């Protein structure tokens, strides 16, 4: 997280705001609800208090505007700039302006007013932009899902380094960005995608170029807004530029940023028993047209040519891959080697000699 130079913080704890005007995109009640919610995010973890004024000069004057809207800083029409706010101070200090060329909503569509406002008010209280892609204070908007909003841990620490903690935080365990240097790191799923490793953890993925040592960290929703935050398994069809993503009994096929026509589908369509309730890991072999799918302690092999399950399946992992334990968290394949992830460990399995040839912490895939 980052605070402002000179550490601009408010002096008093009891603060006022005023919704100077409104957008036509939403009713007055919805807008007031969004703004109230946005303030609650910050008040829930600080001694700060917020009060709405219907008339006069408040500390935080909130307005909607379009292009040239009265300051030095015109808005730019649809998308791009969503809003701007000033740090704590007198007059413009604390003020927040919203671009009414955006379509503001209380849903996943257009732009969510509560989300932008919660971000905007972070500035109004003295937080600068964060470099953590998982932080609310990250400079770039991402709809984070209809799930109930939890302030991320980077923002809690930032704001509490300004104003200390509150009496009681309604959920004290705040979402943290995963730490790649932590040797206890376990993974959700892995694939290659256009020659790069995609490593899923929680609502994030790392993308790592083979020529790079520092992975890029994204929110999954940054790439695929209509996909779940957490995924179970991922695999690639490089021939068709397709990635396949599993979560519960659904699965999607993706072409770049696009969900193919017809997806998500049920995994039962793959020929899975109806009692299989998640795929734990998956890997495709293109020189064979065969995909391996893991769940609990079993493997299925799927024929990606003839579009059916192979006959001798399911089999036990303990029979086909002796020594890797009883589950597969995530798996990928490279250069005749299969990489099996089980908790904090990865097993390097040689297809050639049909044995584990190497063992190392899961996080070492991220050069850590």
């Amino acid at each position: 997280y980052n605070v402002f130079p000179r550490t601009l913080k408010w002096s008093k704890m009891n603060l006022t705001y005023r919704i100077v005007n409104y957008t036509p995109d939403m009713t007055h009640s919805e807008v007031e609800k969004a703004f109230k919610k946005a303030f609650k995010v910050w008040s829930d973890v600080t001694p700060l208090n917020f009060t709405r004024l219907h008339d006069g000069i408040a500390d935080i004057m909130i307005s909607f505007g379009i292009k040239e809207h009265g300051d030095f800083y015109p808005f730019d029409g649809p998308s791009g700039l969503l809003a701007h706010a000033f740090p704590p101070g007198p007059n413009y200090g604390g003020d927040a302006h919203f671009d009414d060329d955006e379509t503001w909503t209380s849903s996943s569509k257009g732009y969510n007013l509560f989300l932008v406002a919660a971000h905007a008010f972070g500035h109004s209280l003295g937080l600068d932009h964060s470099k953590d892609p998982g932080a609310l204070m990250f400079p770039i908007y991402t709809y984070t899902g209809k799930s109930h909003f939890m302030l991320p841990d980077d923002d809690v620490q930032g704001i509490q380094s300004l104003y200390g903690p509150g009496d009681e935080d309604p959920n004290p365990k705040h979402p943290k960005t995963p730490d790649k240097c932590d040797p206890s790191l376990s993974l959700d799923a892995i694939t290659s995608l256009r020659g790069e490793t995609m490593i899923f953890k929680d609502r994030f993925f790392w993308r790592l170029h083979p020529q790079q040592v520092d992975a890029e960290l994204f929110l999954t929703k940054s790439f695929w807004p209509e996909l779940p935050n957490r995924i179970d398994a991922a695999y690639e069809h490089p021939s068709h530029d397709l990635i396949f993503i599993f979560r519960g009994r659904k699965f999607w096929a993706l072409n770049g940023y696009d969900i193919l026509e017809g997806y998500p589908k049920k995994i039962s369509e793959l020929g899975l028993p109806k009692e299989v309730k998640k795929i734990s890991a998956a890997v495709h072999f293109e020189d064979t047209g065969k995909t391996l799918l893991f769940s609990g302690n079993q493997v299925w092999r799927y024929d990606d040519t003839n579009h059916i399950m192979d006959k001798d399946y399911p089999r036990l992992i303990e029979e086909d891959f002796p020594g890797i334990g009883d589950k597969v968290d995530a798996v990928y394949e490279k250069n005749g080697y299969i990489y099996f992830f089980n908790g904090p460990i990865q097993f390097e399995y040689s297809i050639w000699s049909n044995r584990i040839v190497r063992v190392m912490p899961a996080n070492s895939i991220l050069w850590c």
Binding site: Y73, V116, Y141
Partner: peptide
């Protein structure tokens, strides 16, 4: 007189 130079802007790309 004041730090209205620390305007921060929130962004999404087209």
């Amino acid at each position: 007189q004041f730090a209205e130079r620390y305007l921060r802007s929130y962004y999404h790309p087209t």
